[PDB]
Coordinates of C-alpha atoms in Angstrom, one line a residue:
Chain I
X1 CA 2.0 18.6 -84.6
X2 CA -1.5 16.9 -85.1
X3 CA -0.7 14.0 -82.9
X4 CA 1.2 15.8 -80.1
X5 CA -1.6 18.5 -79.8
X6 CA -4.0 15.6 -79.2
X7 CA -1.6 13.9 -76.7
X8 CA -1.0 16.9 -74.5
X9 CA -3.8 17.8 -72.2
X10 CA -3.2 21.5 -73.3
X11 CA -6.4 23.2 -74.4
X12 CA -6.8 24.1 -78.1
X13 CA -9.5 25.7 -80.1
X14 CA -11.5 24.2 -82.9
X15 CA -12.0 26.9 -85.6
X16 CA -8.3 27.8 -85.3
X17 CA -7.0 24.2 -85.2
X18 CA -9.0 23.7 -88.4
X19 CA -7.3 26.6 -90.3
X20 CA -3.8 25.3 -89.3
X21 CA -4.4 22.0 -90.9
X22 CA -6.8 23.2 -93.7
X23 CA -4.4 23.6 -96.8
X24 CA -2.2 20.6 -95.8
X25 CA -4.0 17.7 -94.2
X26 CA -7.5 18.4 -95.5
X27 CA -5.9 18.2 -99.0
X28 CA -4.2 14.7 -98.3
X29 CA -6.4 12.2 -100.2
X30 CA -7.8 9.0 -98.8
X31 CA -7.9 10.5 -95.3
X32 CA -9.9 13.7 -95.8
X33 CA -9.0 14.6 -99.4
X34 CA -11.6 12.3 -101.0
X35 CA -15.3 13.4 -101.4
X36 CA -16.8 11.3 -98.7
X37 CA -13.6 11.8 -96.7
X38 CA -14.5 15.6 -96.5
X39 CA -17.2 14.6 -93.9
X40 CA -14.4 12.9 -91.8
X41 CA -12.7 16.3 -91.7
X42 CA -16.0 17.6 -90.5
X43 CA -16.2 14.6 -88.1
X44 CA -12.9 15.8 -86.6
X45 CA -14.9 18.6 -85.1
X46 CA -16.5 16.3 -82.6
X47 CA -13.1 14.8 -81.6
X48 CA -11.4 18.0 -80.9
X49 CA -14.2 19.3 -78.6
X50 CA -14.8 16.0 -76.8
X51 CA -11.1 15.9 -76.0
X52 CA -11.0 19.3 -74.5
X53 CA -14.1 18.2 -72.5
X54 CA -12.3 15.1 -71.2
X55 CA -9.3 17.0 -69.9
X56 CA -11.4 19.9 -68.5
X57 CA -13.4 17.6 -66.4
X58 CA -10.6 16.3 -64.4
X59 CA -9.0 19.7 -63.7
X60 CA -12.1 21.7 -62.9
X61 CA -14.2 20.3 -60.1
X62 CA -16.6 23.3 -61.1
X63 CA -16.5 25.6 -64.1
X64 CA -19.4 27.9 -65.0
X65 CA -21.4 26.7 -68.0
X66 CA -21.0 30.1 -69.7
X67 CA -17.3 29.9 -69.5
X68 CA -17.3 26.4 -71.1
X69 CA -19.4 27.5 -74.1
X70 CA -16.6 30.1 -75.1
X71 CA -13.8 27.5 -74.7
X72 CA -15.7 24.9 -76.7
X73 CA -16.6 27.5 -79.3
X74 CA -20.3 26.3 -79.7
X75 CA -23.7 27.4 -78.8
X76 CA -25.1 26.3 -75.4
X77 CA -27.4 23.7 -77.0
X78 CA -24.8 21.7 -78.9
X79 CA -22.7 21.8 -75.8
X80 CA -25.5 20.5 -73.6
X81 CA -25.9 17.4 -75.9
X82 CA -22.1 16.3 -76.0
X83 CA -21.8 16.4 -72.1
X84 CA -24.7 14.0 -71.9
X85 CA -23.2 11.3 -74.3
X86 CA -19.9 11.4 -72.5
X87 CA -21.6 10.6 -69.2
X88 CA -23.6 7.7 -70.7
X89 CA -20.3 6.1 -71.9
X90 CA -19.1 6.7 -68.4
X91 CA -15.5 8.1 -68.9
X92 CA -16.6 11.0 -66.6
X93 CA -19.7 11.6 -64.7
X94 CA -21.1 15.0 -64.2
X95 CA -24.0 17.1 -63.0
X96 CA -25.4 19.9 -65.2
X97 CA -27.7 22.6 -64.0
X98 CA -30.3 23.8 -66.5
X99 CA -30.6 27.6 -65.8
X100 CA -27.1 27.6 -67.1
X101 CA -25.4 28.7 -63.9
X102 CA -22.8 25.8 -63.4
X103 CA -21.6 22.6 -64.8
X104 CA -20.1 20.8 -61.9
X105 CA -17.7 18.1 -63.3
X106 CA -17.3 15.6 -60.5
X107 CA -17.9 12.0 -59.6
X108 CA -18.9 12.3 -56.0
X109 CA -16.8 10.6 -53.3
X110 CA -18.3 9.4 -50.0
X111 CA -17.5 10.5 -46.4
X112 CA -16.2 7.0 -45.6
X113 CA -13.6 7.0 -48.5
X114 CA -12.6 10.6 -47.8
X115 CA -12.1 9.8 -44.0
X116 CA -10.2 6.5 -44.8
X117 CA -7.8 8.5 -46.9
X118 CA -7.2 11.1 -44.2
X119 CA -5.6 8.5 -41.9
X120 CA -3.0 7.7 -44.6
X121 CA -1.7 11.2 -45.2
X122 CA -1.0 11.3 -41.6
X123 CA 1.0 8.0 -41.6
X124 CA 3.4 9.4 -44.3
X125 CA 4.1 12.7 -42.3
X126 CA 5.2 10.4 -39.3
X127 CA 7.6 8.5 -41.6
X128 CA 9.1 11.9 -42.9
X129 CA 10.5 12.9 -39.4
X130 CA 12.0 9.5 -38.7
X131 CA 14.2 9.5 -41.8
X132 CA 15.5 13.0 -41.3
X133 CA 16.7 11.9 -37.7
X134 CA 19.2 9.2 -39.1
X135 CA 20.6 11.9 -41.5
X136 CA 21.1 14.5 -38.7
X137 CA 23.5 11.9 -37.2
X138 CA 25.5 11.6 -40.3
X139 CA 25.7 15.4 -40.9
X140 CA 27.4 16.4 -37.7
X141 CA 30.2 13.9 -38.5
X142 CA 30.5 15.2 -42.0
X143 CA 31.5 18.7 -41.0
Chain V
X1 CA 44.3 -9.5 -38.2
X2 CA 43.6 -11.0 -41.7
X3 CA 44.4 -14.6 -41.0
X4 CA 41.8 -14.9 -38.1
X5 CA 39.0 -14.1 -40.6
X6 CA 40.2 -16.9 -42.8
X7 CA 40.5 -19.5 -39.9
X8 CA 37.0 -18.8 -38.7
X9 CA 35.4 -19.3 -42.2
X10 CA 36.1 -23.2 -42.5
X11 CA 35.1 -23.6 -38.8
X12 CA 31.9 -21.6 -39.2
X13 CA 30.9 -23.4 -42.4
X14 CA 31.0 -26.8 -40.6
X15 CA 29.0 -25.5 -37.6
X16 CA 26.2 -24.1 -39.6
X17 CA 26.5 -23.7 -43.3
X18 CA 23.8 -21.0 -43.8
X19 CA 26.4 -18.6 -42.2
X20 CA 28.5 -16.6 -44.4
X21 CA 31.0 -13.9 -43.7
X22 CA 28.8 -10.6 -44.1
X23 CA 30.8 -7.7 -42.5
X24 CA 31.7 -6.4 -39.1
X25 CA 30.2 -4.8 -36.0
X26 CA 31.6 -1.6 -34.5
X27 CA 31.3 -0.8 -30.8
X28 CA 30.4 2.7 -31.7
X29 CA 28.7 4.9 -30.7
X30 CA 30.5 7.4 -33.0
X31 CA 30.2 7.0 -36.8
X32 CA 33.8 7.4 -38.1
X33 CA 35.4 8.0 -41.3
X34 CA 37.9 5.2 -40.3
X35 CA 35.0 3.0 -41.1
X36 CA 35.2 3.7 -44.8
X37 CA 38.8 2.4 -44.6
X38 CA 37.9 -0.8 -42.5
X39 CA 35.0 -1.5 -44.9
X40 CA 37.5 -1.8 -47.7
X41 CA 39.3 -4.8 -46.1
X42 CA 35.9 -6.5 -45.4
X43 CA 35.0 -5.7 -48.9
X44 CA 37.6 -8.2 -50.0
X45 CA 35.9 -11.1 -48.1
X46 CA 32.3 -10.1 -48.8
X47 CA 29.9 -10.8 -51.6
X48 CA 27.7 -7.9 -50.5
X49 CA 28.2 -4.3 -49.6
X50 CA 29.9 -4.7 -46.1
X51 CA 27.2 -4.5 -43.4
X52 CA 28.1 -2.1 -40.6
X53 CA 26.3 -2.9 -37.6
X54 CA 26.7 -0.3 -35.0
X55 CA 25.8 -2.1 -31.7
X56 CA 25.9 0.6 -29.0
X57 CA 27.6 -0.8 -25.8
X58 CA 26.7 2.0 -23.4
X59 CA 23.1 1.8 -24.5
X60 CA 22.5 5.5 -24.0
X61 CA 19.9 5.7 -26.7
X62 CA 17.5 3.2 -25.1
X63 CA 15.5 3.0 -28.3
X64 CA 17.8 2.4 -31.3
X65 CA 20.4 0.3 -29.5
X66 CA 21.4 -0.6 -33.2
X67 CA 22.0 1.5 -36.3
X68 CA 22.5 -0.3 -39.7
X69 CA 24.3 1.3 -42.5
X70 CA 25.5 -0.1 -45.9
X71 CA 28.4 1.2 -47.9
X72 CA 27.2 2.7 -51.3
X73 CA 29.2 4.4 -54.1
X74 CA 27.2 7.3 -55.8
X75 CA 27.7 10.4 -58.0
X76 CA 28.1 13.4 -55.7
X77 CA 26.8 16.6 -57.5
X78 CA 28.2 20.1 -57.7
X79 CA 31.1 18.8 -60.0
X80 CA 32.5 16.8 -57.1
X81 CA 34.2 13.3 -57.1
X82 CA 32.3 10.1 -56.6
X83 CA 31.9 9.5 -52.9
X84 CA 31.5 6.4 -50.8
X85 CA 29.0 7.1 -48.1
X86 CA 26.7 5.3 -45.5
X87 CA 23.0 5.2 -46.2
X88 CA 20.8 4.2 -43.3
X89 CA 18.6 1.1 -43.5
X90 CA 16.1 -0.4 -41.0
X91 CA 18.1 -2.2 -38.4
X92 CA 14.9 -3.2 -36.5
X93 CA 14.8 -6.6 -34.6
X94 CA 12.6 -9.5 -35.3
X95 CA 14.3 -12.4 -33.5
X96 CA 14.5 -16.1 -34.2
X97 CA 12.1 -18.5 -32.7
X98 CA 14.6 -20.5 -30.7
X99 CA 16.1 -17.3 -29.1
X100 CA 12.8 -15.6 -28.4
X101 CA 11.2 -18.4 -26.4
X102 CA 13.9 -18.5 -23.7
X103 CA 14.0 -14.6 -23.5
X104 CA 10.3 -14.5 -22.8
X105 CA 10.7 -16.8 -19.7
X106 CA 13.3 -14.4 -18.2
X107 CA 11.3 -11.2 -18.5
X108 CA 7.8 -10.4 -17.3
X109 CA 8.3 -6.6 -17.8
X110 CA 5.8 -4.2 -19.4
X111 CA 8.9 -3.0 -21.5
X112 CA 9.0 0.1 -23.7
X113 CA 5.6 -1.1 -25.2
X114 CA 3.6 -4.4 -24.9
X115 CA 0.3 -3.0 -26.0
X116 CA -1.2 -5.0 -22.9
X117 CA -4.3 -3.7 -21.2
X118 CA -5.7 -0.2 -21.2
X119 CA -3.2 1.0 -18.6
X120 CA -0.3 0.0 -20.8
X121 CA -1.3 1.7 -23.9
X122 CA -2.4 4.8 -22.0
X123 CA 1.1 5.3 -20.8
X124 CA 2.1 4.7 -24.4
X125 CA 0.0 7.6 -25.7
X126 CA 1.9 10.1 -23.5
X127 CA 5.4 8.6 -24.1
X128 CA 4.8 8.5 -27.9
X129 CA 3.8 12.2 -28.1
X130 CA 6.9 12.9 -26.2
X131 CA 8.9 10.8 -28.6
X132 CA 7.6 13.0 -31.5
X133 CA 8.2 16.2 -29.6
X134 CA 11.9 15.4 -29.1
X135 CA 12.3 14.4 -32.7
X136 CA 10.7 17.6 -33.9
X137 CA 12.7 20.0 -31.8
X138 CA 16.0 18.6 -33.2
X139 CA 14.8 19.4 -36.8
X140 CA 14.3 23.0 -35.7
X141 CA 17.9 23.4 -34.4
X142 CA 19.3 21.7 -37.5
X143 CA 18.0 24.5 -39.6
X144 CA 19.7 27.1 -37.3
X145 CA 23.0 25.2 -37.6
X146 CA 22.9 25.4 -41.4
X147 CA 22.9 29.3 -41.2
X148 CA 24.9 29.9 -38.1
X149 CA 27.6 27.2 -37.9
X150 CA 27.8 26.5 -41.7
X151 CA 27.1 22.8 -42.0
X152 CA 27.2 21.8 -45.7
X153 CA 23.6 22.1 -46.8
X154 CA 22.0 18.5 -46.9
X155 CA 19.3 19.1 -49.3
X156 CA 17.8 15.7 -48.8
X157 CA 16.5 16.9 -45.4
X158 CA 14.9 20.0 -47.1
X159 CA 13.2 17.8 -49.6
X160 CA 11.4 15.8 -46.8
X161 CA 10.4 19.0 -45.0
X162 CA 8.7 20.3 -48.2
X163 CA 6.6 17.1 -48.3
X164 CA 5.6 17.8 -44.7
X165 CA 4.2 21.3 -45.4
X166 CA 2.5 20.3 -48.6
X167 CA 0.8 17.0 -47.6
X168 CA -0.1 18.8 -44.2
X169 CA -3.8 18.8 -43.6
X170 CA -5.2 22.3 -44.1
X171 CA -7.8 23.6 -41.5
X172 CA -11.2 25.1 -42.5
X173 CA -11.5 22.3 -45.1
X174 CA -14.8 20.5 -44.9
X175 CA -12.8 17.3 -44.4
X176 CA -12.5 18.4 -40.7
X177 CA -16.3 18.5 -40.5
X178 CA -16.5 14.9 -41.5
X179 CA -14.0 14.0 -38.8
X180 CA -16.2 15.5 -36.2
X181 CA -19.1 13.3 -37.3
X182 CA -17.0 10.2 -36.9
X183 CA -16.0 11.3 -33.4
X184 CA -19.7 11.9 -32.5
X185 CA -20.6 8.3 -33.3
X186 CA -17.9 6.5 -31.3
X187 CA -18.4 8.7 -28.2
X188 CA -22.1 7.7 -28.3
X189 CA -21.2 4.0 -28.7
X190 CA -19.1 4.3 -25.6
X191 CA -22.1 5.7 -23.8
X192 CA -24.3 2.7 -24.8
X193 CA -21.5 0.2 -23.7
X194 CA -21.2 2.1 -20.4
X195 CA -24.9 1.5 -19.7
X196 CA -24.7 -2.3 -20.5
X197 CA -21.9 -2.7 -17.9
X198 CA -24.4 -1.0 -15.4
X199 CA -26.8 -3.9 -16.0
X200 CA -24.0 -6.4 -15.2
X201 CA -22.9 -4.6 -12.0
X202 CA -26.6 -4.2 -10.9
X203 CA -27.2 -8.1 -11.2
Chain E
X1 CA 41.6 1.8 -84.1
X2 CA 45.3 1.4 -84.0
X3 CA 45.4 2.1 -80.3
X4 CA 42.4 -0.2 -79.7
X5 CA 44.2 -3.2 -81.3
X6 CA 47.4 -2.2 -79.4
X7 CA 45.7 -2.5 -76.0
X8 CA 44.1 -5.9 -76.9
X9 CA 47.5 -7.3 -77.8
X10 CA 49.2 -5.8 -74.9
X11 CA 47.1 -7.4 -72.2
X12 CA 48.0 -11.0 -73.3
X13 CA 51.3 -10.3 -71.8
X14 CA 50.7 -7.8 -69.0
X15 CA 47.9 -9.2 -67.0
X16 CA 50.0 -12.3 -66.1
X17 CA 53.4 -10.5 -66.1
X18 CA 52.5 -7.8 -63.7
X19 CA 50.3 -10.1 -61.7
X20 CA 47.7 -7.4 -61.9
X21 CA 46.8 -5.0 -64.6
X22 CA 43.6 -3.4 -65.9
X23 CA 43.2 -2.4 -69.6
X24 CA 39.5 -1.6 -69.7
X25 CA 40.1 2.1 -69.1
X26 CA 41.4 2.9 -72.6
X27 CA 38.8 0.8 -74.4
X28 CA 35.7 2.8 -73.2
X29 CA 37.5 6.1 -73.5
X30 CA 38.2 5.3 -77.1
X31 CA 34.5 4.4 -77.8
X32 CA 33.3 7.8 -76.6
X33 CA 35.7 9.3 -79.2
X34 CA 34.3 7.2 -82.1
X35 CA 30.8 8.5 -81.3
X36 CA 32.2 12.0 -81.0
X37 CA 33.9 11.9 -84.5
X38 CA 30.7 10.8 -86.0
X39 CA 29.0 13.9 -84.5
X40 CA 31.5 16.4 -86.2
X41 CA 31.1 14.3 -89.4
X42 CA 27.3 14.9 -89.5
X43 CA 26.4 11.2 -89.0
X44 CA 24.1 12.1 -86.0
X45 CA 22.0 8.9 -86.1
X46 CA 25.0 6.6 -85.9
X47 CA 26.5 8.5 -83.0
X48 CA 23.4 8.2 -80.7
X49 CA 23.1 4.4 -81.3
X50 CA 26.7 3.7 -80.2
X51 CA 26.3 5.8 -77.2
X52 CA 23.2 3.8 -76.0
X53 CA 25.2 0.5 -76.3
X54 CA 28.0 2.3 -74.2
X55 CA 25.5 3.0 -71.5
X56 CA 24.8 -0.7 -71.2
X57 CA 28.5 -1.6 -70.7
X58 CA 29.3 1.3 -68.3
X59 CA 26.7 0.4 -65.9
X60 CA 27.6 -3.4 -65.7
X61 CA 30.9 -2.2 -64.4
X62 CA 30.6 -1.4 -60.7
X63 CA 33.7 0.8 -60.2
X64 CA 34.8 3.2 -62.9
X65 CA 37.3 6.2 -62.7
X66 CA 35.7 9.6 -63.0
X67 CA 37.4 10.5 -66.2
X68 CA 35.5 7.7 -68.1
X69 CA 32.1 8.7 -67.1
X70 CA 32.7 12.4 -67.7
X71 CA 33.9 11.8 -71.3
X72 CA 30.8 9.7 -72.0
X73 CA 28.6 12.4 -70.6
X74 CA 30.5 15.1 -72.7
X75 CA 29.4 13.2 -75.9
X76 CA 25.8 12.5 -74.7
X77 CA 25.4 16.2 -74.1
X78 CA 27.0 17.3 -77.5
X79 CA 24.5 15.3 -79.4
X80 CA 21.5 16.8 -77.6
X81 CA 22.6 20.5 -78.3
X82 CA 23.3 19.7 -81.9
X83 CA 19.6 18.7 -82.4
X84 CA 18.4 21.9 -80.6
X85 CA 16.3 20.0 -78.0
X86 CA 16.6 22.7 -75.3
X87 CA 14.9 20.7 -72.5
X88 CA 16.9 17.6 -73.3
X89 CA 20.2 19.4 -73.6
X90 CA 19.7 20.7 -70.1
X91 CA 18.5 17.5 -68.4
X92 CA 21.4 15.3 -69.8
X93 CA 24.0 18.1 -69.4
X94 CA 23.3 18.1 -65.6
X95 CA 24.8 14.6 -65.5
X96 CA 28.0 15.9 -67.1
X97 CA 28.1 18.8 -64.5
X98 CA 27.8 16.5 -61.5
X99 CA 30.8 14.2 -62.3
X100 CA 32.8 17.1 -63.7
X101 CA 36.5 17.4 -63.0
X102 CA 37.0 20.4 -60.7
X103 CA 40.5 20.3 -62.4
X104 CA 41.3 23.1 -65.0
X105 CA 41.8 20.3 -67.7
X106 CA 38.5 21.6 -68.9
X107 CA 39.7 24.8 -70.4
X108 CA 38.1 28.1 -69.6
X109 CA 36.9 28.5 -73.3
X110 CA 34.9 25.3 -73.1
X111 CA 33.2 26.4 -69.9
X112 CA 31.8 29.5 -71.6
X113 CA 30.2 27.7 -74.6
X114 CA 28.2 25.1 -72.7
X115 CA 27.2 27.6 -70.0
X116 CA 25.8 30.1 -72.5
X117 CA 23.8 27.4 -74.2
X118 CA 22.4 26.1 -70.9
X119 CA 21.3 29.5 -69.7
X120 CA 19.4 30.1 -72.9
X121 CA 18.0 26.5 -72.5
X122 CA 16.5 27.4 -69.1
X123 CA 14.8 30.5 -70.3
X124 CA 13.1 28.4 -73.0
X125 CA 12.3 25.8 -70.4
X126 CA 9.0 26.1 -68.8
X127 CA 9.5 24.3 -65.5
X128 CA 13.3 24.3 -65.3
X129 CA 13.8 26.7 -62.4
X130 CA 17.3 25.3 -61.6
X131 CA 19.5 28.4 -62.0
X132 CA 21.4 28.5 -58.7
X133 CA 23.2 25.2 -59.1
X134 CA 25.2 26.6 -62.1
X135 CA 26.8 29.0 -59.8
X136 CA 28.3 26.2 -57.7
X137 CA 29.4 24.2 -60.7
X138 CA 32.8 25.2 -62.3
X139 CA 31.0 25.7 -65.6
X140 CA 29.7 29.2 -64.7
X141 CA 31.6 29.5 -61.5
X142 CA 34.8 31.1 -62.9
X143 CA 33.1 33.4 -65.4
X144 CA 30.5 35.8 -64.2
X145 CA 32.2 39.0 -65.3
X146 CA 31.8 38.5 -69.1
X147 CA 29.8 41.0 -71.0
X148 CA 27.7 38.0 -72.1
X149 CA 27.0 37.3 -68.4
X150 CA 26.0 40.9 -67.7
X151 CA 22.6 41.1 -69.6
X152 CA 22.0 37.4 -69.1
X153 CA 22.1 37.6 -65.3
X154 CA 19.7 40.5 -65.2
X155 CA 17.1 38.2 -67.0
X156 CA 17.7 35.5 -64.4
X157 CA 17.4 37.9 -61.5
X158 CA 14.2 39.6 -62.8
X159 CA 12.6 36.0 -62.8
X160 CA 13.8 35.3 -59.3
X161 CA 12.1 38.2 -57.5
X162 CA 9.2 37.8 -59.9
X163 CA 8.9 41.5 -61.1
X164 CA 7.1 41.8 -64.4
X165 CA 7.8 45.6 -64.8
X166 CA 11.5 44.8 -64.6
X167 CA 11.4 41.8 -67.0
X168 CA 9.4 43.8 -69.6
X169 CA 12.1 46.6 -69.7
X170 CA 14.9 44.0 -70.1
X171 CA 13.2 41.8 -72.6
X172 CA 12.8 44.6 -75.4
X173 CA 16.5 45.1 -75.5
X174 CA 17.6 41.4 -75.6
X175 CA 14.9 40.5 -78.1
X176 CA 16.7 42.7 -80.6
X177 CA 20.4 42.1 -79.5
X178 CA 20.3 38.4 -79.6
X179 CA 18.2 36.9 -82.6
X180 CA 17.8 33.6 -80.6
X181 CA 15.6 35.4 -78.1
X182 CA 13.9 37.2 -81.0
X183 CA 12.3 34.0 -82.6
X184 CA 11.6 32.7 -79.0
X185 CA 9.8 35.7 -77.8
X186 CA 6.6 33.9 -77.0
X187 CA 8.3 31.4 -74.5
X188 CA 10.2 34.1 -72.7
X189 CA 7.0 36.1 -72.1
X190 CA 5.5 32.8 -70.8
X191 CA 8.4 32.1 -68.4
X192 CA 8.0 34.9 -66.1
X193 CA 4.2 34.0 -65.6
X194 CA 4.8 30.4 -64.6
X195 CA 7.7 31.3 -62.3
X196 CA 5.6 33.7 -60.2
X197 CA 2.6 31.3 -59.7
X198 CA 4.7 28.5 -58.1
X199 CA 6.8 31.0 -56.0
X200 CA 3.8 32.9 -54.6
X201 CA 1.7 30.0 -53.3
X202 CA 4.6 28.5 -51.5
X203 CA 5.7 31.5 -49.4
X204 CA 2.2 32.2 -48.1
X205 CA 1.1 29.7 -45.4
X206 CA -2.2 29.2 -47.3
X207 CA -2.0 26.6 -50.2
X208 CA -5.0 27.9 -51.9
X209 CA -5.1 31.2 -53.8
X210 CA -8.1 33.1 -55.1
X211 CA -8.1 34.1 -58.7
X212 CA -8.2 37.7 -57.1
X213 CA -4.9 37.1 -55.2
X214 CA -3.1 35.7 -58.2
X215 CA -4.2 38.5 -60.4
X216 CA -2.2 41.0 -58.2
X217 CA 0.7 38.5 -57.8
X218 CA 1.2 38.0 -61.5
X219 CA 0.3 41.8 -62.1
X220 CA -1.9 40.7 -65.0
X221 CA -5.8 40.7 -65.3
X222 CA -8.0 37.9 -63.8
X223 CA -9.2 37.1 -67.3
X224 CA -5.6 36.1 -68.4
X225 CA -5.0 34.3 -65.0
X226 CA -7.7 31.8 -65.5
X227 CA -6.3 30.7 -68.8
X228 CA -2.7 30.6 -67.4
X229 CA -3.5 28.5 -64.3
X230 CA -5.3 25.7 -66.4
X231 CA -2.1 25.2 -68.4
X232 CA -0.2 24.9 -65.0
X233 CA -2.3 21.8 -64.3
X234 CA -1.6 20.3 -67.9
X235 CA 2.2 20.8 -67.6
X236 CA 2.2 19.3 -64.1
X237 CA 3.5 22.6 -62.6
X238 CA 0.9 22.6 -60.0
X239 CA -1.8 19.9 -59.7
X240 CA -5.1 20.6 -58.0
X241 CA -8.7 21.6 -58.6
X242 CA -10.3 24.7 -60.2
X243 CA -13.5 26.1 -58.7
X244 CA -14.8 29.1 -60.5
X245 CA -17.6 29.4 -57.9
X246 CA -15.5 29.6 -54.8
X247 CA -13.0 31.6 -57.0
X248 CA -10.2 29.4 -55.9
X249 CA -7.4 27.2 -57.2
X250 CA -6.7 24.5 -54.5
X251 CA -3.2 23.0 -54.9
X252 CA -2.5 19.7 -53.2
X253 CA 1.1 19.4 -54.5
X254 CA 4.0 21.9 -54.7
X255 CA 6.6 20.5 -57.2
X256 CA 10.3 20.6 -56.0
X257 CA 11.9 23.9 -56.3
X258 CA 15.5 24.5 -55.2
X259 CA 15.5 26.0 -51.6
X260 CA 17.8 29.0 -50.8
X261 CA 19.1 30.8 -47.7
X262 CA 16.0 33.0 -47.3
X263 CA 13.5 30.2 -47.8
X264 CA 15.2 28.2 -44.9
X265 CA 14.0 31.0 -42.5
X266 CA 10.4 30.7 -43.6
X267 CA 10.5 26.9 -42.9
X268 CA 12.2 27.6 -39.5
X269 CA 9.3 29.9 -38.5
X270 CA 6.6 27.2 -39.4
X271 CA 8.4 24.5 -37.4
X272 CA 8.7 26.9 -34.4
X273 CA 4.8 27.1 -34.3
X274 CA 4.7 23.3 -34.5
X275 CA 7.1 22.7 -31.6
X276 CA 5.2 25.0 -29.3
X277 CA 2.0 23.2 -30.0
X278 CA 3.3 19.6 -29.1
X279 CA 4.7 21.0 -25.9
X280 CA 1.2 22.6 -24.9
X281 CA -0.5 19.2 -25.5
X282 CA 2.0 17.2 -23.6
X283 CA 1.9 19.4 -20.4
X284 CA -1.9 19.2 -20.6
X285 CA -2.2 15.5 -20.8
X286 CA 0.5 14.9 -18.1
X287 CA -1.6 16.7 -15.5
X288 CA -4.8 14.9 -16.7
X289 CA -4.7 11.2 -16.0
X290 CA -1.8 11.8 -13.5
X291 CA -3.4 9.6 -10.9
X292 CA -3.7 6.6 -13.1
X293 CA -1.5 5.9 -16.0
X294 CA -0.6 2.4 -14.7

């Protein structure tokens, strides 16, 4: 249930995930159950939230900063810091707006790339008609 | 005649050995269900699915003077028995070198398409639109025939049409605005080329 | 085993004596049965692993009689529903329904057991919107007048037309009647939501919906809708982009859903529009450039 949660891009919440796994896996020694392993339970906090970030970026071109703070379950300030590290390490790239209006998850795409791409969608529509025509032939015989 | 197929094989092997028996042509035009039955005798000879080459002899369809179809065997759903059926494949002509060179001496036509000068392709733009329009109307009447004359619903067709509505450009999108910019540039470049030709004519 | 050895012996003689016989029919059929015994015997690990090996052989053969491939599929299916993998039961079971003997060899009693399990599987699916195909398959075809297929159909039908008032009324009863729906309350409640979102966007010509529009469609608050739609992207139900500032969800993909008589009409209407346009263009460009084409 721990691995498959983390595998699926389905959103989960930290202080609730924590409870689920508190009396079971927090109490397995040499993982999280040792004294200095308790701070690896604590380090899991960071993992859970950076994962939810990673998914949310792709799906939402734009999401309001306020909304994000509730989903992530942390103050605005902590939230501000974790976005910045994830951009540095370059998995995503993003633009954050300081008055706290929007966080616009996007890597921008130029006019040339967007236009080049438009010609291809059109090429595929033209194919679609052509195939149907052979099968019209067939179908009249079949009945 | 079984024996004739056999006799020809040792003759054709000597003549050119890259030849193999590969199937049979039908005069067509009609696609029969007697062709499932003829394919089974050719299937004895052949090492491939028997190639059915429908060479139209009346040449009514100017474009597509050829259809190619290969016998497949596939699980028919709805709890129905496995069916042997004809799946279309690209019959499109390429030509060998030796054949092509003589053909080219004979003709000098501007054909269905040569992509020659401006004049030739300008014709093409009208004709090609008209090709599509023809194609398109038939798809409209096919859908009436499902619900009026009770053809068995060929769901494949419906699948393709979903992909047409979905991957259909949507208007009001800012992509359209981009398009207009590209248009603006080329129409300008035409204007500058037009002027340079003025300088040539003036000399 | 006795019969397997019998057929090996037998063919030493027959293949030459007859000048033609095939003996491969019995062998495969027999192997399906081994796997099947093991299933009843509660050796579930063993039975899967034989079955996979079987798969390899079957497919090397290029012509098999229907009976063979249906028995294999009968087994492959039986294993899935014993593990209580609902999704998997349903996917693999479709293969068995396709090759199925329209013959009444498959006794009426068998048809009811698998059909019930499948229906229940589809409710507890989350993207399995196949429900009409069953009606054209023997499995459910003959039996639609059982008491079991009274309540159960009303659940299917409430999904189809997408009414949430109707679903809600039905679901209270069936949660209590049937203890399988009772432990799977959460999924059933989720099913209706997902079904409506994919149905609504399609039928409207626009392939973008405001969170405002969806809120009325799904007859649930816009607060709940934002959470629901995010999940649709994760599942792969719909794929697209979420803009909270333009208050839109822009789809760029509509996942295959089975088309039905009504829906054919909606498509016909869109293509009508398209045909008239090509014509207007072509008449226009003929007049223009008339003087010089060539």
